[PDB]
Paper text:
pmcDeoxynucleoside triphosphohydrolase (dNTPase) enzymes are effector proteins in animal and bacterial cells that hydrolyze dNTP nucleotides and inhibit viral replication. We therefore named the dNTPase-NTase anti-phage defense system Clover and designated the dNTPase protein as Clover protein A (CloA) and the accessory NTase protein as Clover protein B (CloB). Likewise, CloA exhibits strict dGTP substrate specificity, with the activated enzyme only hydrolyzing dGTP and leaving other dNTPs including dTTP unaffected. Together these results demonstrate that CloA is a dGTPase effector that senses phage infection by specifically responding to elevated dTTP concentrations associated with viral replication. Clover defense encodes an accessory enzyme CloB that synthesizes an additional nucleotide signal p3diT that suppresses CloA activation and protects uninfected cells from aberrant nucleotide depletion. p3diT binds to CloA in an allosteric site adjacent to the dTTP binding pocket and raises the threshold of intracellular dNTP levels required to trigger full Clover immune activation.
To test this hypothesis, we purified Salmonella enterica CloA from cells co-expressing CloB and determined a 2.7 Å cryo-EM structure of the resulting CloA complex. We observed strong difference density at the interface between each CloAA and CloAB protomer in a pocket lined by highly conserved charged residues, including R29A, R34A, R38A, and R314B. We observed strong density that could be unambiguously assigned as a nucleotide ligand composed of thymidine di- or tri-phosphate connected to a second thymidine base with a canonical 3′–5′ phosphodiester linkage, and we named this nucleotide signal p3diT (5′-triphosphothymidyl-3′5′-thymidine). Using liquid chromatography-tandem mass spectrometry (LC-MS), we observed ions of peaks of 785.1, 705.1, and 625.1 m/z, corresponding to the masses of p3diT and the related hydrolyzed diphosphate (p2diT) and monophosphate (p1diT) forms. No nucleotide product masses were identified when CloA was expressed with a catalytically inactive CloB mutant D71A/D73A enzyme, supporting that CloB is responsible for synthesis of p3diT. Introduction of p3diT was alone sufficient to inhibit all CloA dGTPase activity in vitro with an IC50 of ~7.6 μM. We observed that p2diT was less efficient at inhibiting CloA dGTPase activity (IC50 of ~20.9 μM) and that dephosphorylated p3diT (p0diT) had no detectable effect, consistent with the 5′ terminal phosphates of p3diT being required for high-affinity interaction with the charged CloA ligand binding pocket.
Residue numbers in the entry:
A (entry chain E): 236 to 468
B (entry chain B), C (entry chain A): 0 to 16, 19 to 468
Write the structure that this text describes.
Amino acid sequence: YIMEACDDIAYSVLDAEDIIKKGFASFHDLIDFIQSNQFCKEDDVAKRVIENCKKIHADYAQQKLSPAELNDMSMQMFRVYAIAELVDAVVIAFKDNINEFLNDTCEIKDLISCSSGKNLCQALKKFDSSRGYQHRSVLKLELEGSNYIKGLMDMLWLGIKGRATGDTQYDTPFGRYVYGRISENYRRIFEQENNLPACYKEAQLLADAISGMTDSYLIALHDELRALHQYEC
Amino acid sequence: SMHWNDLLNSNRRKPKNKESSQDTSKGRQQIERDYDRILFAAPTRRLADKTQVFPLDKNDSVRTRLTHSHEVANLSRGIGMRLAFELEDDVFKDVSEDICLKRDVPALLAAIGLVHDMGNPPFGHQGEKAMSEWFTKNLPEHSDNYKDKIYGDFRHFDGNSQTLRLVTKLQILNDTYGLNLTYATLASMIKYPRSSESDSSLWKKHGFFLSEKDVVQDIWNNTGLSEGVRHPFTYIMEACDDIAYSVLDAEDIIKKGFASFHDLIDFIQSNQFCKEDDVAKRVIENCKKIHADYAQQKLSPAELNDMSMQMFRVYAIAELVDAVVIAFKDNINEFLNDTCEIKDLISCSSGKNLCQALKKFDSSRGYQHRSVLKLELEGSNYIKGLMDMLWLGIKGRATGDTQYDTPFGRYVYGRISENYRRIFEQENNLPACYKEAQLLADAISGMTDSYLIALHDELRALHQYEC
Amino acid sequence: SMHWNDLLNSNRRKPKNKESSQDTSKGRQQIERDYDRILFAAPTRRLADKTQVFPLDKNDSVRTRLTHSHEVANLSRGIGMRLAFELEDDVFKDVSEDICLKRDVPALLAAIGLVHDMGNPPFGHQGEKAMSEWFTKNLPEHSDNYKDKIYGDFRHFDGNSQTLRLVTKLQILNDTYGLNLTYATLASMIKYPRSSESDSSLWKKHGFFLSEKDVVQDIWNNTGLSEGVRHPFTYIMEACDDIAYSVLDAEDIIKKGFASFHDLIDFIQSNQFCKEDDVAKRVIENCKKIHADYAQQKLSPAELNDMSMQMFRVYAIAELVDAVVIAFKDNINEFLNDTCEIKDLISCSSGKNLCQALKKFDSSRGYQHRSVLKLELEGSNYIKGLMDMLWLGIKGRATGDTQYDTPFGRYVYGRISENYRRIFEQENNLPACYKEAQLLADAISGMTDSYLIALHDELRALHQYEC
Ligand SMILES: [Mg+2]
Ligand SMILES: [Mg+2]
Ligand SMILES: [Mg+2]
């Protein structure tokens, strides 16, 4: 529960900070979104964060700063205040509900919802979704990554399917090379004799191969095998 | 039969609420505010990126949609000032003193001239054809889904209906009011007062879509017009548009080098109907008289051709505008009748032969040039490819079928402008297939040439996996 | 002291000849004919290819020179209609009945608004700087050839003087009359009524070149103005230009994503002079009132920002126009005095603080953006390279020295427009170095950004052998 609460706090705060840094929004936009949010109008944590942010922003505009620098350090202060408040709320909620967490019949979905920073975290998640996750560039790169992943998965399945069931459509040179390109440990685990169904083993091999790759590695492998798949297509 | 009081109605469709501090009207008339709204609208600025006939990338001072619209607006404003300052007694009779003609008529004519080509599809007139062809292939008439005549709105897509939709309903705010223009302006925007559902011989094309039908009815109820009856100022706007077409397209043809001033002079002189036309004779004589003195000075052939065609433009525009004004003044009673059957104002004027000859010259020399045809084919290919690519993500969104749930389909749907999708997702009485086709038409019509090409290339790059 | 009869002179510099069949005036006033001449001029169409502040290649609906000129013309026309239809008694007194104010004043203001940025060099204001810098390096002040103050016309090159030259002398026909505008229009074009030879503290920049000095004198003799005295309508034109700058540049900044509506609201609220300004307070209150209702509906953040800034533009333009009109009406007697010392109309109005804050916001957010600075540097490099490359073929053509006789120099000279070279080769009293520098300035100023880049690349390719 503590790990999930920390992950959610990091998501909600640092993604908003990255959104402001990338120029998809501004500090004043986030302040207005928090102030006008339905559940954050009366939240004590949100009120304190907004007041502290404005108090620091007045003194911050006193000095001679560029708009980018002002936005950056204003969002740094917002990050500090929000992280402090959310961490304190999460710790208090965990301390208060420690008996329920230690029970064998615990039904709490998440620690944040039981804390006082629930509204602020929800508003930050909504802001991140509306401004950052649904941005045009983000959607375009998501589509590109989906295309890359699906192409690589089809190209690997051309050489993986049938390796355990018994059928031998993988014996093409491209299939053998594709199988050889997979990491050795994954194939060693796949070739082991266990009680898993053959189709399950093949699909698990593909999942392990795909999940272990980075973006650059996945793109490079996809391009290389696309170049090498020209004859069989 | 019709009264100028109803034809010049300054009321707006949106009901009145607003404190005095929010009053932005100032000393401006309502129709002047409509003109200002049209000028400051984003599509007006986007019109600069749309080609009229010839490519705009070359620095040959060709006229785009924005320049043509401004020229038409200027001509309409000049005609309006002539009507309101000199021919007021002959034209405007029994007009209430609450209407300031000197401030409304020129502003109204300029506003309707500026907005006449604001909702047209990109890539020029060919674009419309392409759209129609695409719909004719993708909304089959024999199919039960697209059997009704309403889908003709898309099989015979027209820029005027899309312009009315864009100025009345197609805005960011879905208030069904758009720019909230006055009733007189909206009535003058309707070029053909009929829909595809109705069958008429006076008007070939339809002037509004089914979705705007009720709105059009409201306009009629607030203007005194009816189905098949055209607002009197629409004739003036169409005459100005035709004059601008015939003259400035010829000027652009001469500038681009597809012909010369002497070629145009010979074509006009040898034309069957312009051999005895007084207007054509006067234009030719004035052109030759200026050209003799013009060749007296030391000028390059390009410079001589350019300024000779400038003089030709001046003389032709003056003669055609005078003829159009005279024809409108003479036939004012017929225009105000509820049973007016005049097709266009130019045909009733003395500049009919000159305008027809100029249109024939433009068609033979400019519109059928090899480069123009090649770019028209390229634009048609771009439009059809983009339409197929968007239909991959649009079809089934309203009917119920779920073939659009592919990642490419979702991204394609998300690439469409938010206001178009907001209108499409609204719950109305339109058929689902009609709503989907209207969404596609709105998406395609609102794009410029550069934007359309960029989107087509980007989505073609992103469509590689699913192909 | 000055009379509106002389300030609104409808006569033209070109002496009258012409049969009745050649009369193209029709029912148009002379100033209306001037507006039509300006609109149909080739530089007016070429203005669409020149960037105002931001690049025009992107389809972000940014405003170019043509759009900005049309907006300024519309604002000036609105102010003129307000003056001629409502404030006629307060402003126009002792005006002869032969002058139709309702048809001349709006037309005059629109014409001077449309032509105010017609002769400006490409690549925006930075272009001018680049030109000046180039001249400051290539026309040294210490040198005896370029020691006179007249060459300051090129060391402190201004777009207003080039615009006056282009509308008065720089045409295809070298008749020293150009478009042959009326005396009132020409008088209103002169923004700064002084030259570089004269030293004045009221006006920083010079308003006309040496070559046009006599022409300017003639204008004064036919208008009743004098050196250091500015036409009253020039104040209105400058106020409209400043309002359009301050408001529409901020709108373009918000549209381009360099800032947001809330950022502008906070900047206006926290501004030192806008904390207590009534106009700024009213604008902020109206913006927030509309923004609350606007956020009630379901809108994307981009759409909300866009229409919120549209509302801000509407309110700010209304308030600033009203303030400018009130200031002009109140100080009409001082403007008509021969010893007027008012620097600008906005400073005397109540919208001074709002306009200053908007200008500061535009400078801090838009004009000093990284992309804007990079494109300004690129344009400066292009302009300086083209100027050096042209000077290789221009220098010595009039003084007598023959270093230009290289094939590259001859081709470079031939690439210049024919009318510029025709004017340069004319035998006048201007010094040879002044004529050469004026030829270069006319060649550079008349080019668009795309044309300048294309010519620079082509001549760079053709200059490889001689380098
Ligand atoms: Mg995580
Ligand atoms: Mg047209
Ligand atoms: Mg300007």
